[PDB]
Design a protein around this ligand. Structure first.
Ligand SMILES: [Cl-]
Ligand SMILES: [Mg+2]
Lengths: 243, 231, 240, 195, 250, 235, 244, 241, 111
């Protein structure tokens, strides 16, 4: 054997074990989700409060690309930042040449090709993050989830991290109970609930909730963080549902 | 075991052993403490010597008039990273006539450390840093780890036996955070914090190293007879 | 470009590639350098498993770097050509900028520096060569003899030997060479050099090369008959 | 720089070269040797742009000396001249060309014959019985056309050379402060001290 | 990133063998049989068209390739490696010869260039050798007709006739019995078809056999008239119909 | 094999740690700093009696106000000295002043970690850099291949280092004279050296503000050796 | 990374030998024998083709003997493809020297440069060495007739008579026995063939398994001629000495 | 045994990394099929959307390379998209350099040459994909050309790819034995799509809904994919016969 | 053709006493016959008790002052907060100016 010692090496199965090993690092990370809604998308993430010494609201994990795309990830946090830095370069060069802001499907492939490129050589390591991202463009709302292999698809709902199965189950119920669609303000509240429900798989340390959203009506198509009254309203809704 | 030959290799459980070994170099390093209020931010560092004939390894480095860090681990790596910060702080001044935000300083260090963990040939940085600063949003304290993970905190400590100081600060949180407009008292709290990490040795005059930055205080370091006040 | 770090430290603090390069030197034919009161003599072994050779055209063991400095060696022959070439180029480059030929110390220092560079450069192995560099500085009558080795260290010697069975001939020179009174004449210096090689060589026929360097660019190589006379004289005195 | 002459006779090559180094309205030196020994039996005189001349002469000298040490053998005058020509032929299409004209006088020991080569800064080589660079040629060529014979001795060649220097001193506008004369033959290179 | 493989992947073993070249020759052995026969007034090169599937159109896959108007090539071993070699061989004929001398290279020199390319894959950094043996047939004014074999090592040998690949050992023995120095081109084509039938197992017709010749100039295949010195390509690929005609009088 | 810039499980660079073993094999070098000057001394250690010991150059001048002693693979030090000398002279050109001893040492130590897959391996030599400047006065620095440097009041490096360092621990005080330091280096060298110490197999040097960096003659060192033997017999 | 797959071609053994050079020499020892013999009035080059097939085109073939310029030729032993890379370099180097100095290149200078190239592949670059040994036969006006050999190590030496390739041990003993200094070319031709005939692994030495060449001053007055022997000419010289 | 990790020869003359890339081809467990009509070329592929949270419209293994050329992939989606983007760039550059639309077979060769390079050069791995290119070429007419990790490529009368490729292949072979021709003798592309689905149903033995299939159609001057309703309309036509 | 230089006018003046020094300069900034600013300072405190002015082409002047100020900052970082002496500052400025010998800073500098 020894097929798992080097990146870009095919095993006799036809698998790249190094990428599958990177997935384990993603599974180890905190929970993050994405919910597609009527005219936009909502992102949320679990922030483990390791200590009292952590300053609240001041270790932001959700990142913005351009002015209309939001990105969140689980796994090796630095790797995620590297990917977003590239995403921002890609989105900047697209706008530079084509004038219009980069469409979400276009942006999704830019990250996809870049992550896939890190499975082609033994001189680089695969990315240790699954990235949930999306936004609003000329064709409406789009939600995506990107994995270490470079694989990505469009999603109605997406989840990754240590509490992915709990979150997926909760996401599947929303898709069934709301065939016509979920509103942006509703999706924020639901996102809070699902992070709280997914926290059961990481319940030693208590956590800090962080939500962001893009919506054609509510945020005017731009990415914004949910803060203050709207955040506390969503936290209370989540607190009521666990009890 | 078989997956620790270089940084480009994941383990079967999804671990980067070279990054974890770099993290181990910090644990061997001498203790250093960081803490802040709303007006000031303070670094306290226990310096280490080779023997009685030698000097005490300088732990604290100045980055700009409003920012600086303390180190624990490989000192040459701290010099490289501190030099990079000096340049980034300086770029912000010359080009934008703007003092570099302490948060951005952390983001830049994270991204520099990360690139070393994903490429063949290179190695992770073998040092941990505590960055303090005062900018347009008040006082700040950051903890840098060579995995790339940067964290903003009220207080913290890194190095050998840092758990003693970190527990103390976790208890004292409500007290020292409200030491506003009083430098000497915030330092005292930091000197008392680092004392919880001492074993057999005590704080002497050429052993202790203190730094401070704040609202009306540039980043300045105190060594020698200037720290005798706090013993 | 090929980058591999071939010369690296081992757990015990040794650079094996440099040490294995010394083994190549130990395999090479013996070379000896003895400096007298007014001269330096370079002696060299030539292995006699090669008959049907053409000695006119075969590369000589002692090489002129400039008109006043010579270089003999032990180890890999192909490697030595590269060092000799570089040294010869630096010799002319020194004359061009300083308007003065190289000192024997400077030339040695350059050659040693090249050897050292190949011990911590990526993609290259060390030179499997040790050199004896001898001559006279410009406008100076004090004899100079230096030694270099793969690691890059160099030093001055009253007399020295390198190559195979060098430890035997070094033993000989250590008791037979008086620091207080070096070989006063050319004859005495050549004889002591030939004597030292006769401890190791085999036959004193076409196995020994002798080159004599005197002050002010006065370098000459001895012929077979001239060397054979020393061999004949030494053996007759030995039977006593 | 300015005046460099060359005369090949029966058994030797004689090179005459002016001693004056002028800059502006000042003669800075009156004892300048505008020549370099490339090898024991090969001498090169030079004239042209300030700085370029000596820089080029010494660069050639270093290369020929390097060859001599490497092969333990002296290059033929023909071989040295061909090397020099090629260096100038490269130079002329460089960013900044060497503006140097040269004469190469040598004694071929294998042929037992003197040889004189004239090469300009463009890399234009010619073997000649007598040669000159610059304005000198406009006087000396016609003079030598008349008085030169191929079977002359070295002493006859020196008298022939005196005749050239006298003519130049009479008709040339500038004071070139006499010449340094050097003879190249079977015994090597030597300088005439009283000219 | 970047090609970090700047070192040789083919090296000498203690016994003196170059492992990768030997293994490349093993890959050639597994390959389908191809052959070449030199006549007095021409050369023939032939091979079996091993179809990967009956749904596949074997006409689209050309094992015998034109390199110059007077030179053709066939192979045994790995098809993809052959394809890229043909591309490089066609280009080198122009860059390193035709664009300089205004005429196509002679067979021996083009062969020499192809050999150089294959030799470099044996020594250069981060590459394996080519897994093919080529048979190059060609004509030029001053050397006449010629036939060459090029191995993975980069070595090349001229042949009167030879075979490479699957059943080369038996095919070479067959050719030794039949070959003489007075063979006409049509006689060589006849022998080529006989030799190839031994190695082929399934169907044996113009659709499963690929065969080309280096013979007389073909003015009809030139594409233009008006220049007397230009008389047309000597390389011609035999059609499926032209092969079947000769298989009746076999 | 394995990467050149690889970390061990304990959090140390393998190659840097192995180069430290090479330095332990090297000849002894001692440095002592006083208020009257800094003394540097080394063991020459000739491999054979035929080798002319005065050609062994293990103490070296960087500038008039900075000296240097070495131990380990001494061939590796040549490029370090060359860099130090250029750094010193270059700073004088840019700033019309002497360069600080610490700044010089820091510049040399920047080369140390410039290895990997830059040079192929770390340096196999340790340096004792002694000097004087107007700000921090007489200083002694120990520069390692790790890229780290410590200032010392006194320091020994090489094969007899741990034994000599323990001896320096007892003997050093802040009121040592230059003459006292000279004898102390000779005393400690004679203890740890294999062969018997004399003027030919050991070398002394010092740096003072007034006279700058000076390597001592064999005649001058011989008298200090004779002065040392008499003083030890005198009680 | 790629370190895993690096053979490290340019390193020393614990004994101080270059692995790849030693193994390349082992490769060359299986190649067809080539002999060079230097006489007072010329040089002979003789070489045995590697197990020939009856359908091999013999007349339009070149395997062992190659021409570098009008005055210098080489006999090859090892990988032909490798040798041709080095031969084209050597041919270019000869023309560079002629272009620079307007004189034909001295034999040793050409030999040294080709040997220096081989040396480079053993010290740096991480590539395998050239699996080739040359016998250089040439003439210049300094040393006259000269024989040299070079091998994968990049080391070269001069010879009166020498063999490379297979059975050099046996071949060198036979040459050392019958060679003498006042020898003529026609005698050297006979010695070369007699040596191959005894050292050959084949049953009997024939014209179709040989390449032959002479470098004489047998042209008209003070000039050198290279003669690469044709098949029929080898057949005749083999009969003339009474081998067939 | 490092000869199994990079693309160098094994003692038996094999490239194991190339062979293992072939096995990665079937990792998706999807079967594709391609056939030619008179005027058109139809390609069909199975569409399996297991997760309920997926947006089914974004799940696709058929690509529009150029206006005229279409491509279906058998293999993982990252490598599939890698190959698609490169093919799109190559087809665009070809048009710019040579002044006419890149032919299906020429693109296939170019992509095959790239695949060949990964089998010879060590630092690049092969892509674990099989690329099936389809078009109605202006010279050659309806065209199907297929590429694999070995760098092999060839034209096809019809073809199939996937885990159950062999069952589909023989099913098609038997039809062309019967029909005695190289193509589907049909006027409209609608009925050629119906043929393709019918013969896939027979070979695989499964029934298909509108969301279980994915259809690409190449006609003169355009290649296009069918929507769910376009396939549903097609499925209804098969059922009513 | 684009002319990269301009003349911003004004004048400066430096005088040295026994235990003090003055560096004066007018505050007018001009181009051609137009006044740009009546108060635009061009005499700057650069730290370490060094005052500097680079009068002539203001863009080059500001660029130079900016670079020297930055040179003082890095002198502290690299040499343990040592004070930059006026003689050392002068030599440093020579290298700044001469660095652009073939595309000069169009300024007369005084410190
Ligand atoms: Cl291509
Ligand atoms: Mg002319």
């Amino acid at each position: 054997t020894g097929y798992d010692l080097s990146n870009s090496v095919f095993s006799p199965d036809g698998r790249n074990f190094q990428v599958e090993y990177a997935v384990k690092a993603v599974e180890n990370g905190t929970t993050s989700i994405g919910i597609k809604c009527n005219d936009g998308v909502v992102f949320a993430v679990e922030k483990l409060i390791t200590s009292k010494l952590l300053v609240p609201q001041k270790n932001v994990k959700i990142q913005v690309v351009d002015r209309h795309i939001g990105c969140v990830y689980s796994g090796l946090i630095p790797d995620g930042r590297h990917l977003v830095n590239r995403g921002r370069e890609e989105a900047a060069s697209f706008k530079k040449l084509y004038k219009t802001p980069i469409p979400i499907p276009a942006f999704a492939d830019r990250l996809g090709q870049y992550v896939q490129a890190h499975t082609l050589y033994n001189s680089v390591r695969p990315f240790g993050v699954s990235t949930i991202f999306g936004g609003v463009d000329k064709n409406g709302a789009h939600l995506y989830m990107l994995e270490p292999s470079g694989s990505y698809w469009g999603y109605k709902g997406a989840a990754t991290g240590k509490g992915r199965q709990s979150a997926k189950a909760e996401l599947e119920k929303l898709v069934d109970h709301h065939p016509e669609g979920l509103s942006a303000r509703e999706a924020v509240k639901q996102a809070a609930k699902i992070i709280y429900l997914a926290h059961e798989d990481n319940k030693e340390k208590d956590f800090e909730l962080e939500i962001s959203w893009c919506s054609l009506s509510e945020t005017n198509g731009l990415h914004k963080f949910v803060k203050g009254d709207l955040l506390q309203e969503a936290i209370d809704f989540a607190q009521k549902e666990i009890n | 075991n078989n997956y620790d030959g270089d940084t480009v290799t994941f383990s079967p459980t999804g671990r980067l052993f070279q990054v974890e070994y770099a993290l181990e170099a910090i644990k061997q390093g001498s203790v250093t403490v960081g803490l802040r209020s709303n007006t000031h931010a303070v670094l306290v560092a226990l310096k280490r010597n080779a023997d009685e004939l030698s000097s005490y390894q300088k732990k604290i480095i100045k980055c700009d008039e409003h920012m600086g860090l303390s180190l624990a681990g490989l000192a040459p790596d701290a010099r490289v990273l501190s030099n990079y910060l000096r340049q980034q702080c300086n770029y912000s001044s010359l080009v934008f006539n703007r003092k570099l935000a302490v948060e951005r300083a952390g983001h830049l260090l994270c991204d520099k450390a990360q690139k070393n963990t994903q490429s063949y040939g290179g190695r992770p940085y073998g040092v941990g840093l505590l960055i303090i600063g005062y900018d347009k949003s008040g006082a700040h304290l950051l903890e840098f780890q060579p995995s790339g993970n940067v964290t903003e905190l009220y207080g913290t400590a890194i190095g050998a036996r840092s758990q003693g100081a970190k527990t103390y600060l976790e208890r004292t949180l409500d007290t020292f955070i409200k030491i506003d407009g009083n430098p000497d008292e915030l330092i005292k709290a930091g000197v008392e914090a680092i004392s919880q990490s001492l074993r057999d040795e005590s704080l002497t005059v050429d052993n202790l190293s203190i730094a401070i930055v704040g609202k009306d205080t540039p980043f300045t370091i105190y060594d020698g007879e200037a720290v005798a006040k706090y013993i | 470009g090929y980058d591999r770090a071939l010369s690296i430290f081992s757990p015990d603090g040794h650079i094996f590639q440099v040490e294995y390069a010394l083994e190549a030197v130990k395999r090479g034919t013996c070379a000896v350098g003895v400096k007298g009161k007014n001269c330096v003599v370079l002696g060299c072994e030539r292995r006699s498993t090669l008959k049907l050779q053409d000695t006119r055209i075969t590369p000589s063991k002692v090489s002129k770097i400039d008109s006043h400095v010579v270089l003999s060696f032990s180890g890999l022959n192909a490697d030595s050509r590269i060092l000799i070439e570089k040294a010869r180029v630096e010799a002319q480059s020194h004359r061009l900028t300083l308007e003065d030929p190289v000192t024997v110390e400077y030339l040695t220092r350059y050659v040693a520096g090249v050897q050292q560079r190949y011990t911590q450069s990526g993609g290259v192995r060390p030179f499997g060569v040790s050199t004896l560099i001898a001559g006279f500085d410009p406008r100076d009558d004090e004899p100079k003899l230096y030694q270099t080795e793969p690691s890059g260290i160099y030093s001055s010697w009253s007399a020295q030997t390198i190559g195979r069975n060098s430890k035997t001939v070094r033993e000989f020179l250590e008791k037979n060479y008086d620091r207080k009174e070096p070989p006063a004449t050319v004859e005495e210096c050549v004889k002591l050099t030939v004597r030292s090689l006769l401890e190791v060589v085999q036959t004193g026929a076409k196995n020994i090369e002798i080159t004599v360097v005197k002050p002010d660019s006065d370098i000459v190589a001895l012929s077979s008959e001239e060397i054979n006379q020393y061999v004949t004289q030494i053996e007759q005195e030995k039977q006593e | 720089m300015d005046i460099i002459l060359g005369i090949r006779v029966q058994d030797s090559v004689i090179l005459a070269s002016s001693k004056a180094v002028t800059r502006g309205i000042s003669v800075l030196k009156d004892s300048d040797d505008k020549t370099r020994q490339l090898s024991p039996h090969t001498l090169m005189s030079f004239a042209g742009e300030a700085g370029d001349t000596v820089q080029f002469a010494e660069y050639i000298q270093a290369n020929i000396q390097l060859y001599s040490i490497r092969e333990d053998y002296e290059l033929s005058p023909q071989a040295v001249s061909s090397f020099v020509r090629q260096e100038l032929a490269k130079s002329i299409r460089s960013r900044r060309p060497y503006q140097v004209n040269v004469l190469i006088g040598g004694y071929d020991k294998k042929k037992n014959k003197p040889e004189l080569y004239q090469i300009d800064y463009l890399g234009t080589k010619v073997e000649l019985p007598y040669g000159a660079h610059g304005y000198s040629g406009f006087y000396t060529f016609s003079l030598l056309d008349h008085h030169y014979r191929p079977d002359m001795t070295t002493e006859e060649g020196l008298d022939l050379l005196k005749l050239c220097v006298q003519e130049l001193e009479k008709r040339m506008p500038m004071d070139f402060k006499g010449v340094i004369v050097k003879i190249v033959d079977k015994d090597g290179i030597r300088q005439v001290d009283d000219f | 990133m970047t090609d970090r493989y700047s070192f040789s992947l083919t090296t000498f073993s203690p016994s003196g063998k170059l492992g990768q070249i030997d293994y490349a020759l093993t890959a050639v052995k597994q390959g389908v049989t191809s052959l070449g026969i030199k006549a007095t007034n021409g050369v023939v090169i032939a091979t079996e068209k091993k179809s990967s599937s009956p749904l596949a159109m074997s006409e689209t896959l050309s094992k015998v390739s034109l390199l110059t108007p007077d030179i053709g090539a066939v192979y045994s071993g790995m098809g993809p490696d052959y394809r890229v070699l043909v591309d490089k061989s066609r280009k080198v004929a122009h860059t390193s010869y035709k664009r300089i001398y205004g005429e196509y290279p002679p067979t021996k020199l083009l062969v020499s260039e192809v050999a150089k390319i294959m030799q470099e894959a044996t020594q250069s950094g981060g590459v394996r050798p080519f897994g093919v043996s080529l048979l190059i047939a060609g004509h030029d004014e001053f050397n006449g007709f010629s036939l060459y074999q090029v191995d993975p090592s980069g070595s090349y040998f001229p042949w009167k006739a030879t075979a490479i690949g699957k059943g080369s050992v038996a095919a070479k023995t067959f050719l030794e019995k039949r070959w003489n120095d007075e063979l006409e081109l049509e006689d060589a084509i006849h022998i080529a078809l006989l030799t190839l039938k031994e190695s082929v197992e399934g169907e044996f017709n113009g659709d499963t056999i690929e065969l080309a010749i280096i013979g007389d100039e073909n003015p009809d295949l030139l594409g233009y008239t008006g220049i007397p010195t230009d008389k047309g390509p000597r390389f011609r690929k035999l059609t499926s119909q032209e092969i079947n005609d000769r298989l009746e009088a076999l | 094999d394995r990467g050149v810039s690889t970390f061990s499980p304990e959090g140390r660079l393998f190659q840097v740690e192995y180069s430290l073993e090479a330095i332990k094999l090297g000849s002894t070098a001692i440095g002592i700093a006083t208020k009257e000057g800094v003394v540097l001394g080394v063991e020459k250690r000739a491999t054979s009696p035929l080798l002319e010991s005065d050609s062994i150059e293990k103490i070296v001048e960087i500038d008039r106000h900075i000296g240097c002693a070495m131990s380990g693979l001494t061939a590796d030090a040549r490029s370090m000295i060359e860099h130090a000398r250029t750094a010193a002279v270059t700073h004088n050109l840019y700033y019309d002043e002497d360069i600080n001893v610490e700044s010089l040492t820091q510049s040399v130590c920047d080369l140390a970690l410039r290895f990997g897959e830059l040079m192929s391996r770390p340096f196999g030599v340790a340096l004792l850099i002694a000097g004087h400047d107007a700000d921090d006065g007489y200083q002694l620095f120990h520069a390692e291949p790790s890229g780290t440097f410590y200032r010392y009041n006194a320091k020994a490096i090489g094969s007899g280092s741990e034994g000599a360092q323990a001896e320096l621990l007892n003997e050093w005080h802040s009121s040592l004279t230059l003459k006292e330091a000279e004898l102390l280096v000779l005393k400690i060298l004679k203890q740890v050296m294999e062969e018997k110490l004399d003027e030919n197999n050991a070398q002394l040097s010092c740096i003072t503000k007034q006279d700058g960096f000076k390597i001592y003659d064999n005649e001058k060192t011989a008298e200090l050796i004779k002065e040392l033997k008499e003083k030890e017999a005198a009680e | 990374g790629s370190r895993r797959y690096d053979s490290r071609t340019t390193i020393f053994s614990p004994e101080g030998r270059l692995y790849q050079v030693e193994y390349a020499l082992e490769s060359i020892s299986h190649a067809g024998t080539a002999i060079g013999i230097m006489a007072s009035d010329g040089i002979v080059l003789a070489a045995e083709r590697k197990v020939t097939s009856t359908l091999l085109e013999q007349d339009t073939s070149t395997e062992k003997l190659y021409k570098l310029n009008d005055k210098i030729a080489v006999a090859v032993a090892g990988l032909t493809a490798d040798a041709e890379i080095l031969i084209n370099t050597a041919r270019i180097h000869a023309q560079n020297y002629l272009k620079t100095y307007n004189e034909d290149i001295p034999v040793e200078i050409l030999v040294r440069r080709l040997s220096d190239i081989k040396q480079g592949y053993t010290q740096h670059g991480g590539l395998r060495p050239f699996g080739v040994s040359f016998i250089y036969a040439g003439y210049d006006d300094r040393y006259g007739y000269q024989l040299y050999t070079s091998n994968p190590s990049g080391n070269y030496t001069g010879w009166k008579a020498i063999s490379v390739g297979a059975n050099t041990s046996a071949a060198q003993t036979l040459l050392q026995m019958d060679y003498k200094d006042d020898m003529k070319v026609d005698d050297a031709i006979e010695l070369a063939l007699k040596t191959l005939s005894k050292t050959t692994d084949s049953s009997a030495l024939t014209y179709d398994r040989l390449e032959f060449a002479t470098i004489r001053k047998g042209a008209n007055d003070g000039e050198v001629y290279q003669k690469i022997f044709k098949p029929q000419e080898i057949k005749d010289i083999l009969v003339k000495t009474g081998i067939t | 045994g490092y000869d199994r990790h990079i693309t160098i020869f094994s003692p038996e003359g094999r490239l194991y990394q190339v062979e293992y890339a072939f096995k990665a081809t079937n990792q998706t467990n999807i079967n594709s099929l391609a056939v030619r009509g008179k005027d058109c070329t139809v390609v069909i592929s199975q569409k399996k959307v297991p997760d309920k949270l997926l947006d089914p419209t974004t799940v696709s293994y058929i690509f529009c390379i150029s206006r005229t050329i279409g491509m279906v992939v058998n293999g993982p989606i990252p490598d599939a998209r890698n190959a698609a983007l490169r093919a799109k760039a190559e087809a665009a550059e070809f048009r710019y350099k040579y002044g006419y639309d890149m032919p299906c077979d020429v693109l296939a060769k170019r992509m095959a040459n790239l695949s060949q390079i990964y089998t010879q050069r060590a630092y690049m791995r092969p892509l674990g994909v099989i690329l099936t290119f389809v078009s109605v070429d202006e010279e050659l007419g309806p065209s199907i050309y297929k590429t694999d990790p070995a760098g092999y490529y060839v034209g096809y009368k019809a073809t199939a790819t996937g885990p159950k490729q062999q069952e589909i292949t023989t099913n098609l072979e038997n039809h062309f034995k019967k029909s005695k021709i190289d193509h589907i003798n049909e006027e409209s592309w609608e009925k050629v799509v119906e043929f393709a689905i019918t013969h896939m149903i027979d070979a695989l033995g499964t029934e298909f809904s509108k969301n279980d299939l994915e259809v690409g159609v190449a006609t003169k001057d355009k290649f296009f994919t069918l929507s769910a309703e376009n396939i549903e309309e097609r499925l209804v036509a098969i059922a009513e016969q | 053709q684009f002319n990269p230089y301009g003349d911003n006018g004004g004048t400066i003046l430096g005088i040295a006493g026994e235990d003090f020094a003055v560096l004066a300069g007018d505050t007018r900034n001009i181009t051609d016959y137009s006044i740009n600013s009546r108060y635009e300072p061009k005499v700057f405190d650069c730290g370490d008790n060094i005052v500097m002015s680079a009068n002539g082409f203001a863009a080059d002047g500001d660029a130079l002052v900016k670079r020297f100020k930055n040179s003082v900052k890095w002198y502290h970082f690299d040499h343990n907060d040592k004070k930059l002496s006026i003689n050392s500052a002068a030599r440093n400025i020579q290298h700044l100016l001469y660095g652009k010998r073939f595309f000069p800073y169009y300024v007369h500098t005084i410190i």
